[PDB]
Amino acid sequence: SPALLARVNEKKAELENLKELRDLSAAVAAQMEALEQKLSTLSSGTEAIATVLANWHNVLRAISMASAKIPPQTLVRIP
């Protein structure tokens, strides 16, 4: 009986530890959600610079087509 009183005290300490672990795991997952948001923002910035490469790539090809002229209308696209 008194030994079992000490046993339940051990279990009390264990439960306190477990509660802290549970709280920490919840906080961990919360941080993962926040992390995912920031990573999405990063990818957005990368997409922006991909747009920049699209600009210069079209520039280069447009010039090369004019530069490679070795033997029209004005219809273009103006968003």
Partner: protein, 50 residues
């Protein structure tokens, strides 16, 4: 568009033959219309004389 339409439309080269046939048939159609117009004119002249 110069070289672009050149290569593209040259590959379209078989399609355009039908367009040529269209224009030729349009000419033949109005030619038969001219024949009918001549028939009407001569009809008016002969009937008025009668």
């Amino acid at each position: 568009l110069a070289a672009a339409e050149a290569s593209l439309r040259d590959e379209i080269g078989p399609f355009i033959q039908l367009l040529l046939d269209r224009a030729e048939k349009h000419l033949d159609r109005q030619a038969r219309r001219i024949e009918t117009l001549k028939a009407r004119a001569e009809l008016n002249a002969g009937r008025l004389s009668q």
